[PDB]
DNA sequence: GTAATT
DNA sequence: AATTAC
């Protein structure tokens, strides 16, 4: 989990954050998505957010 | 619901 | 429970 991602925080804001952890979330038979774990700087809360389909895992 | 992750 | 989207 290295390169920053443009994400929409729960607080409301657009923000360029670096995920703590990234991984692929896909069922058998389907493409699924890539997901990042992030900490909202506005609140310290944790939240998850889709990554672009070519974000490196 | 399913997939992983925490 | 949440993430996405099929």
From Swiss-Prot:
InterPro entries per record: Cren7_sf, dsDNA-bd_Cren7
Keyword annotations from UniProtKB, A to Z: Chromosome, Cytoplasm, DNA-binding, Methylation
Modified residues (N6-methyllysine): 13
Compartmental location: Chromosome; Cytoplasm
GO MF annotation: an example: double-stranded DNA binding
Assembly and binders: Monomer.
Function recorded in the entry: A highly abundant chromatin protein, it binds double-stranded DNA without sequence specificity; there is approximately 1 Cren7 molecule for 10-12 bp of DNA. Constrains negative DNA supercoils. Induces DNA compaction and mediates intermolecular DNA bridging. Binding does not require protein methylation. Binds single-stranded DNA weakly. Increases DNA stability against thermal denaturation. Promotes formation of loose nucleoprotein structures with long DNA in the presence of albA proteins.
HAMAP family cross-referenced by the UniProt entry: Chromatin_Cren7 (MF_01387)
Protein name, UniProt field: Chromatin protein Cren7
Species in which this protein is naturally found: Saccharolobus solfataricus (strain ATCC 35092 / DSM 1617 / JCM 11322 / P2) (Sulfolobus solfataricus)
Lineage: Archaea, Thermoproteota, Thermoprotei, Sulfolobales, Sulfolobaceae
Protein's gene: creN7
